[PDB]
């Protein structure tokens, strides 16, 4: 039911401290499976998921090769950027690049991604049509023009519909019981008095996958945004995710508030009340 594979690239220049640091990670949906760090004691593509370890040496050698090539080219892009924005070589700068493909249920390509930022701001991104590019500024227009000149969008499109999908399906089959799972969130409501006239209601959602989830509070059956605090979805450290949503309530109205939780692993959405 719609899956995704994405690669994340981060190159940071560090003047005086040698070559720029290169860190790239691979994800299937919300599960990391590979990792390459130029500052590792023996830089190479490493497995971070149990279901990818079964790949033979050829896979790790090829992956290491591609990762290293990406590192070199990124290092060249740093310099090219210094020249574009007319910046000093004594300052630190960062290039980030995410790309990947979305496997639709019909087995065909659903979505394509190839976007990159410089110093935390959009630089250049592949458009939804997977044929044209969008440049964020003047400097990126050079990259856009020269990428159009050598038909890169098409070349990346060949990968999107080729190796990307094939290997995505492969990963999906090999890690079926962990990637194609829908673990529902363990939920409960807690009560934390703020004073004598108020109290915080906290709705918990623990150990669910994937990270996609929805938590809302309602007063008398009507959604409430006032006096609510929803924290950013956080990882469990074991491959799961957590999230809680709190609401400040007048003492005595606790039973008029309900928590609503929507998740893929839930047969039907949950309506929770504080059970002392």
């Amino acid at each position: 039911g719609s899956h995704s594979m994405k690669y994340f690239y981060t190159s940071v220049s560090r003047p005086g401290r040698g070559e720029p640091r290169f860190i790239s990670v691979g994800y299937v949906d919300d599960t990391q499976f590979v990792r390459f760090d130029s500052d590792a004691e023996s830089p190479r593509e490493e497995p971070r998921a149990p279901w990818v370890e079964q790949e033979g040496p050829e896979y790790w050698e090829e992956a290491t090769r591609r990762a290293k090539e990406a590192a070199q080219t990124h290092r060249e892009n740093l310099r090219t950027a210094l020249r574009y924005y007319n910046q000093s070589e004594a300052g630190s700068h960062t290039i980030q690049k995410m790309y990947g493909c979305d496997l639709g249920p019909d087995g065909r390509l659903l979505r394509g991604y190839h976007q990159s930022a410089y110093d935390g701001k959009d630089y250049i991104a592949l458009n939804g049509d997977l044929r044209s590019w969008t440049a964020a500024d003047m400097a990126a227009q050079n990259t856009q023009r020269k990428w159009e000149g050598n038909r890169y969008a098409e070349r990346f499109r060949a990968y999107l519909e080729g190796e990307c999908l094939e290997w995505l399906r492969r990963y999906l089959e090999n890690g079926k019981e962990t990637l194609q799972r829908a673990d529902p969130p363990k939920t409960h409501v807690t009560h934390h008095p703020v004073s004598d006239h108020e109290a915080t209601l906290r709705c918990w959602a623990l150990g669910f996958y994937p990270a996609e989830i929805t938590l809302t509070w309602q007063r008398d059956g009507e959604e409430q945004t006032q006096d609510t605090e929803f924290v950013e979805t956080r990882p469990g450290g074991d491959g799961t995710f957590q999230k809680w949503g709190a609401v400040v309530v007048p003492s005595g109205e606790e039973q008029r508030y309900t928590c609503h939780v929507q998740h893929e692993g839930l047969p039907e959405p949950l309506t929770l009340r504080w059970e002392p």
Partner: peptide, 9 residues
């Protein structure tokens, strides 16, 4: 699997 070619800016 990673993308073979890397585009230069």
């Amino acid at each position: 699997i990673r993308y073979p070619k890397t585009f230069g800016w």
